[PDB]
């Protein structure tokens, strides 16, 4: 499809995400307040382990298998969650009796299994996984679309669903293995994360970066050797893409969690193992996780000894402009 000139690149530090959902809210309040968009969270944050959003998206199918395009399933509306609705007016102002219940009867929702994770007390474990469109170097959605409605912007590598060209074929929904295009049933068009390109065009960080309260998000062009995203991905090499085996070459990367307490043994004493299982992280990021954690732990140990660590300083991000394209607007 011809490489982009520059590739906007994101880094998500799982050591720092507090699962506050501020980025989920910021994104929705900017881009998905429209007709038919209520069930859509272009940006979402899910508890891992969990079912995610839509539930069981990680076995939905899609992506590439030995370079052949895969056609996965279309998640049914209940897997996204029917957005709950409420009749506040009836009870608060109109004298109607009875609680302001959610409709429908709650059974599913995008953050249904928040903080449940896995493992039995006292070794229950979970962390937070923010997700979005990965603006892949090999976007399966883009190849899938029989109408060429989806394109990757030459100037910044941002992938966009052209809303005039889209005829609702839903091959993209089928083929994105991250389940990040959402079919808008009102307009008969797919909708998905736009990389905040209007913000990026004015030198302002995407809202899910600029408004990241935990200070866990990095953004920049990966060709910029003084960017934190270059440093974390290319230099120190501690930032991995989510499910590399999907074959789409995401351009959103994750620093895996190295903060966290130890497994607790039956006598009450610490193991050396972390409560977050390595096998879980390997499931999300593959076999390189072990060495990344080793680097991270090693570098943090220098900091504990009062030694320098440039890597730790990068993650810490004492100034937000060292993490991102300017967040001021």
């Amino acid at each position: 499809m011809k490489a982009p000139r520059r590739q906007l690149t994101y880094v998500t530090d799982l050591n720092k995400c507090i699962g506050c959902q501020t980025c989920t809210v910021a994104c929705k309040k900017l881009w998905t307040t429209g007709p038919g968009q209520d069930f859509m969270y272009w940006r979402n944050v899910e508890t891992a382990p969990g079912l995610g959003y839509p539930r069981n998206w990680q076995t939905k199918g899609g992506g590439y298998k030995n370079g052949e395009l895969q056609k996965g399933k279309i998640p049914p509306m209940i897997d996204y969650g029917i957005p709950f609705e409420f009749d506040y007016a009836g009870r608060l102002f109109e004298g109607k009796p009875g609680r302001v219940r959610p409709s429908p009867t709650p059974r599913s929702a995008p953050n249904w299994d928040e903080d449940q994770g896995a493992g039995e007390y006292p070794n229950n474990s979970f962390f937070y996984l923010p997700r979005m469109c990965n603006h892949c170097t090999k976007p399966a959605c883009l190849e899938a679309c029989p109408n060429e409605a989806i394109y990757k912007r030459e100037q910044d590598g941002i992938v966009v669903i052209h809303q005039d060209k889209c005829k609702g074929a839903q091959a993209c929904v089928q083929s994105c293995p991250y389940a990040k295009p959402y079919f808008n049933p009102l307009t008969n068009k797919a909708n998905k994360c736009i990389g905040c390109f209007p913000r990026i065009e004015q030198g302002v960080a995407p809202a899910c970066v600029a408004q990241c309260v935990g200070r866990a998000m990095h953004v920049g062009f990966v060709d910029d050797v003084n960017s934190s995203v270059y440093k974390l991905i290319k230099q120190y090499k501690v930032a991995l893409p989510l499910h590399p085996e999907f074959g789409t070459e995401p351009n959103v990367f994750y620093v895996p969690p190295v903060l966290g307490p130890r497994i607790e043994m039956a006598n009450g004493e610490p193991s050396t193992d972390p409560k977050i299982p390595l096998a879980q992280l390997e499931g999300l990021f593959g076999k390189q996780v072990r060495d990344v954690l080793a680097i991270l732990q090693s570098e943090r140990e220098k900091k504990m000894k009062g030694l320098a660590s440039d890597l730790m300083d990068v993650l810490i991000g004492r100034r937000s402009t060292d993490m991102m394209i300017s967040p001021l607007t």
């Binding site: 050591n15 720092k16 507090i18 699962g19 959902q21 501020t22 809210v25 881009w31 957005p83 709950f84 609705e85 409420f86 506040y88 009870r91 608060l92 102002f93 004298g95 302001v100 959610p102 709650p106 059974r107 929702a109 995008p110 953050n111 928040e114 449940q116 994770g117 007390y121 006292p122 229950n124 979970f126 394109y151 912007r153 052209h162 390109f197 209007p198 600029a210 408004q211 309260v213 935990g214 200070r215 969690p257 903060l259 966290g260 307490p261 607790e264 009450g268 004493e269 610490p270 409560k275 504990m304 000894k305 009062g306 730790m312 810490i316 004492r318 937000s320 967040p327 001021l328 607007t329």
Partner: protein
């Protein structure tokens, strides 16, 4: 041209991110964020908010920016959503039914003014009261109703203690209202203990400093019964039994004293641990016991350099050469003393030993240093092995935590609701302060005992008082709200009086004037103004309140942006301008900067700002006072003839403060911490405070409290003039807490689950509970959590309805089963609105109001009643309930 192929169509999204006006906004809620925001309008409609990210950074440490949170970025939903009060509303059905008629402002305010004049005329001005909490959140809106009350004689309320946010044990120890480092200082610590604190959910915009501190090489410990969200990032997790933390703390103190890991110099200088205690009466040896005309309020330590007893300088009986004014947040103004005053110098107070001394009356008595008594009681009762049995934390763990805590410099404790909302949290906090005193980190960057709860600290507090109480706080009626609620809601605390004679202590504290009782002469409260706080929904003893207190009130007035549960149950509901339609300041203890909001658009529908509402009300009161031939009256309590015919002028200083901005500027002008700053400056960018409370505010350095005592050696405003761990008052002896020690939780509720009610990331108290987007990122309604180990034998499945109850009441809520929850307790995110997805009651249905006798002590040096300085905590974490599956509705999952 220079356009890419699809750039024309892309104008569709560029249009979504556009505005024609950008104003400054804030969220005037009780979250402690005080987060700078911009508000974005297009064609007169607010589109959205975004953090302005413009607090000035400090060198070498992470900036505060962006702050914000998930509620804040949907704050505009309360402008346009289904909850908004548009017009004044008068009740037509029974309270709570939501049956209304729209009224004009005139009819609304006249109904109110008529009632207020009658109530003063027919009963007493103290039968009227205004509840409006946390002045720091919105000081102008806070001052509106408090000034109204000030000039008609209505009484005010307390909030800090009523909520259980008041660090009662800190006031007992240090003689201050409270103080704490700003959160940037967490980055200066090598070792942080999160003690009943869940900052991942409950300090959301500040939480980054913790994980950043750790990446910069700090270690963090979480202490919490459940595996809470904050805990997934800490290096070590300690999970004691609920309310047994005190035993953990005392065992840590034992290990530290025994293995001698303490800072003896600091102890000798900054605490009362060298002060001498009479073996016979177990009181402090005092000057009066030794010398004719010797002071009740001066003491002795044993100076090991001269082998002679010496009177320590700085205690209550020692007056400075020139007194200062009283300071609201101090027991007494010890700033009036000179620097160096309590410096140890060549003194060497003994911490161990027994000594004999000659009494005035010829008798010879044996005395011991507090530390000697403390130490012998810890070796006997507070070993790791014994605290292990109580807490369920291994002795090895307790010991290793003690040693780490005392070895890492600096270390700090961060405590919160998990440790502050218990019956005995006062003695628990004294124990945490004992741990800090022992390690010497108090008043150091990255050190100390730092508490965080509500938005209680308005650094410009003299400017606030200037506007709210212009004739002085000493000419203002205050109840203490925990007592007020306990008594007027006729609460049943279930504590049998042969265990703790709550009634006697309470009665004796009122009749001897240690604590207030409003109204006086046993009259009923009659008129209740509630605004800026959802008093009914959050009130402890809610079921008693609804059944007993509520029907005493002839008129209940709620002023609000939205229909919360208090307003739902009110007689008159007045529409208040949204945060983005008003002008106000906004500050907090978490950071040292002044935030503000300004109008983006004019007040919507018929709403008015709070300042304007009490201004307009003042006029109708003038009109009514004349109609009723009752325009002035005497108020013998203050020797104050009140002039109701001049109320408006009184509200505004003869028109000077008739506008919101002049009132906001008035606060800024009348406080040392703010004088110089103008509204226009604040409108542009948040400004740092010019000074603070108990330490210097230094350029480029995070604030950390108490340095004026620790560094400058001014006396602590306590009875002893030190950090005081020995409180030798009769009530403290009665409760077994003359010294810090473990007090086991109240088990008056004879039910088997401990009831936990922590604060959720998904709301700010009851505000945003009902926000549709927030509910959509949960499961559509309130939640109570249980361990699978308790739920399975009750046949309770995830998201089943469960029923929780005790003698106080019952609540039915959908359950969330979470493996991280500790068996034996259930956790219900606190105070969902009564009208939400609950089949009956709410969290407060199962909570009484309870009063610990030590919180009623008001005749012991720094222990005296002052509103929000000292008084009964409204604790609730001792509550116990039973739980069963609710079988009236058992929906299937899919």
């Amino acid at each position: 041209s220079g356009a890419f192929e699809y750039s024309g169509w892309e104008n569709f999204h560029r249009t979504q991110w556009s505005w024609d006006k950008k104003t400054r906004g804030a969220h005037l809620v009780n979250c402690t964020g005080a987060c700078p925001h911009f508000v974005y309008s297009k064609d007169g409609v607010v589109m959205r908010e975004e953090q302005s990210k413009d607090i000035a950074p400090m060198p070498n440490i992470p900036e505060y920016n962006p702050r914000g949170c998930n509620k804040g970025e949907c704050g505009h939903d309360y402008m346009y959503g289904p909850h908004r009060i548009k017009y004044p509303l008068i009740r037509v059905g029974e309270r709570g039914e939501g049956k209304w008629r729209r009224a004009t402002w005139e009819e609304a305010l006249d109904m109110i003014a008529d009632k207020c004049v009658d109530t003063i005329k027919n009963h007493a001005p103290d039968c009227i009261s205004v509840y409006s909490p946390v002045p720091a959140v919105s000081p102008v809106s806070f001052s509106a109703g408090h000034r109204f009350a000030h000039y008609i004689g209505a009484h005010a309320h307390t909030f800090y203690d009523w909520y259980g946010d008041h660090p009662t044990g800190q006031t007992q120890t240090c003689g201050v209202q409270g103080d704490t480092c700003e959160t940037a200082d967490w980055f200066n610590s090598k070792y942080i203990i999160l003690w009943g604190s869940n900052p991942t959910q409950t300090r959301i915009p500040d939480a980054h400093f913790l994980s950043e501190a750790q990446l910069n090489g700090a270690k963090i410990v979480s202490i919490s019964p459940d595996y809470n969200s904050s805990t997934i990032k800490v290096d070590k997790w300690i999970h004691p039994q609920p309310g047994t933390d005190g035993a953990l703390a005392m065992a840590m103190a034992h290990v530290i004293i025994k293995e001698k890991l303490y800072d003896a110099h600091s102890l000798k200088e900054q605490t009362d641990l060298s002060y001498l205690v009479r073996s016979d009466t177990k009181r402090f040896l005092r000057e009066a016991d030794v010398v004719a005309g010797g002071s009740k309020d001066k003491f002795y330590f044993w100076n090991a350099k001269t082998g002679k007893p010496v009177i320590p300088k700085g205690s209550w009986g020692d007056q400075p050469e020139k007194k200062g004014s009283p300071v609201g947040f101090l027991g007494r103004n010890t700033f009036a003393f000179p620097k160096g005053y309590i410096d140890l110098g060549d003194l060497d107070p003994a911490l161990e030993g027994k000594f004999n001394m000659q009494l005035l009356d010829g008798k010879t008595v044996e005395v011991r240093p507090v530390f000697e008594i403390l130490k012998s009681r810890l070796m006997a009762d507070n070993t790791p092995e014994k605290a292990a049995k109580i807490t369920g934390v291994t002795a090895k763990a307790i010991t290793e935590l003690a040693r780490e805590f005392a070895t890492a410099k600096p270390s700090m404790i961060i405590c919160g609701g998990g440790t502050q909302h218990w019956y005995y949290s006062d003695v628990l906090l004294r124990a945490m302060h004992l741990l800090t005193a022992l390690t010497g980190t108090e008043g150091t960057n990255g050190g100390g005992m730092n508490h965080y709860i509500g938005q209680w600290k308005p650094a410009f507090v003299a400017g606030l008082v200037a506007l709210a109480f212009p004739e002085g706080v000493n000419k203002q009626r205050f109840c203490q709200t925990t007592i007020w609620t306990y008594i007027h809601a006729e609460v049943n605390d279930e504590i049998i009086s042969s265990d703790i004679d709550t009634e006697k202590y309470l009665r004796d504290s009122i009749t001897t004037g240690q604590m207030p009782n409003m109204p006086e002469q046993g009259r009923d409260p009659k008129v209740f103004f509630v605004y800026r706080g959802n008093w009914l929904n959050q009130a402890k003893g809610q079921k008693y309140v609804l059944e007993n207190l509520w029907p005493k009130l002839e008129l209940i007035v709620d002023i609000n942006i939205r229909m919360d549960s208090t307003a739902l149950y009110s007689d008159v509901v007045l529409p208040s301008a949204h945060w983005y339609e008003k002008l106000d300041l906004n500050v907090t203890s978490e950071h040292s900067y002044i935030n503000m909001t300004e109008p983006a658009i004019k007040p919507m529908w018929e709403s008015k700002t709070d300042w304007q509402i009490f201004l307009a009300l003042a006029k109708r009161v003038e009109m009514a006072a004349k109609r009723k031939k009752y325009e002035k009256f005497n108020d013998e309590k203050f020797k104050w003839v009140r002039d109701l015919s001049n109320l408006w002028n009184q509200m505004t200083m003869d028109g000077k403060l008739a506008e919101d901005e002049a009132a906001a500027q008035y606060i800024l002008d009348n406080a040392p911490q703010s004088k110089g700053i103008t509204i226009q400056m604040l409108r542009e960018k948040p400004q740092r405070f010019k000074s603070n409370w108990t330490s210097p505010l230094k350029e480029g350095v995070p604030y950390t409290p108490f340095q004026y005592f620790v560094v400058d050696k001014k006396p602590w405003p306590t009875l002893t003039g030190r950090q005081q761990f020995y409180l030798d008052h009769d009530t403290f002896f009665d409760m077994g807490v003359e010294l810090p020690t473990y007090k086991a939780p109240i088990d008056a509720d004879k039910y088997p689950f401990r009831f936990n009610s922590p604060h959720s990331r998904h709301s700010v108290h009851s505000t945003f509970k009902d926000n549709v987007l927030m509910l959509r990122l949960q499961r559509g309604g309130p939640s109570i959590e249980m361990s699978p180990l308790d739920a399975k034998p009750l046949g309770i499945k995830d998201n089943d309805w469960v029923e929780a109850w005790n003698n106080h009441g019952k609540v039915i809520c959908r359950v969330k089963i979470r493996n991280g929850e500790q068996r034996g307790r259930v956790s219900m995110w606190h105070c969902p609105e009564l009208y939400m997805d609950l089949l009956t009651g709410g969290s407060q249905s199962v909570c009484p109001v309870r009063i610990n006798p030590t919180n009623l002590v008001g005749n012991y040096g720094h222990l005296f009643f002052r509103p929000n300085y000292y008084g009964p905590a409204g604790s609730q974490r001792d509550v116990r309930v039973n739980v069963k599956r609710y079988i009236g509705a058992t929906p299937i999952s899919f």
